[PDB]
Amino acid sequence: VKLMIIEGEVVSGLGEGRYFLSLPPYKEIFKKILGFEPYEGTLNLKLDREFDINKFKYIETEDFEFNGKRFFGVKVLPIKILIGNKKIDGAIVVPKKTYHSSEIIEIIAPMKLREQFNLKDGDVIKILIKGD
């Protein structure tokens, strides 16, 4: 059981509220794949080094056709979000296009962690990959 604890600083990204948090196929598939409807948003962390999902066993969702538009699937890597004593299930998400640096990861969880744990930017958490 090869684990991986990684530390990251809560920051804010762009979060147009993004097709893949917002459309039912994505909803339903995260339900399949991760077993939760993720909260419609992402907690972005700044890591101490670059991060590469490909260096892991990621699920890659399929592209969808939704109301005439095509939508690209997303690479998701499941994780445990470690906030103080509590230790939530979540995933690192990587869509097709992303303007941010490789040292930023996005975390999705079943609820908005920001609010549910009153996090501010600058705060640090640990997350737990259990992969490599």
Question: Can you give the binding site for Zn ion, defined by CB under 5 A?
Answer: 13, 98-100
Q: Is 102 in the site for Cl ion (CB under 5 A)?
A: no
77 is in an annotated binding site: no
103 is in an annotated binding site: no
CA-derived radius of gyration, the chain: 14
Query: In angstroms, rounded to a whole number, what is the distance separating the alpha carbons of residues 93 and 2?
Result: 21
Q: Which two tokens stand for residue 57?
A: 């066993």
Query: In angstroms, rounded to a whole number, what is the distance separating the alpha carbons of residues 115 and 22?
Result: 19
Q: Is 127 in the site for Cl ion (CB under 5 A)?
A: no
Judged by beta carbon, residue 42 or residue 61, the one nearer Zn ion is: 42
Q: Is 104 in the site for Cl ion (CB under 5 A)?
A: no
Query: In angstroms, rounded to a whole number, what is the distance separating the alpha carbons of residues 94 and 42?
Result: 11
42 is in an annotated binding site: yes
Sign of the torsion angle spanned by Cα atoms 126, 15, 73, 50 = negative
15 is in an annotated binding site: yes
Question: What residue numbers does the annotated binding site cover?
Answer: 13-18, 42, 44, 98-99, 106, 111-114
Question: What residue numbers does the annotated binding site for Mg(2+) cover?
Answer: 42, 44
| Contact residues for Cl ion, defined by CB under 5 A | 12, 15, 43-44, 112-114
